[PDB]
């Protein structure tokens, strides 16, 4: 059979797309249940079906947020 559903035991967090002003709702999924010993890491983001404006939909920018959050070009340390 099919691979198991990959978010079944992930932490689900509500947030809002960071790009344009539509304000689409997001449902972000992190590896770790919030326990202090697990450092949460977002590994999938999709839309929030209950948001009245977006109703679950996300354009290619919001649908691709994971690659911005986890971009190779994220800044890590103060540099001079």
């Amino acid at each position: 059979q099919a691979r198991n559903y990959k978010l079944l035991r992930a932490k689900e967090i509500r947030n809002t797309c960071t790009y344009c002003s539509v304000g689409c709702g997001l449902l972000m999924y992190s590896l770790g249940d919030g326990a202090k010993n697990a450092r949460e890491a977002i590994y999938h983001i999709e839309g929030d079906p209950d948001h009245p404006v977006s109703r679950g939909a996300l354009c290619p920018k919001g649908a691709g947020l994971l690659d911005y959050v986890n971009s190779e070009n994220r800044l890590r340390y103060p540099e001079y």
């Binding site: 999938h44 983001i45 999709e46 939909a57 996300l58 354009c59 290619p60 649908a63 691709g64 994971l66 690659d67």
Partner: peptide, 9 residues
């Protein structure tokens, strides 16, 4: 969007 959502998922 569908191309992006498909590859992400």
């Amino acid at each position: 969007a569908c191309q992006v959502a498909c590859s992400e998922w």
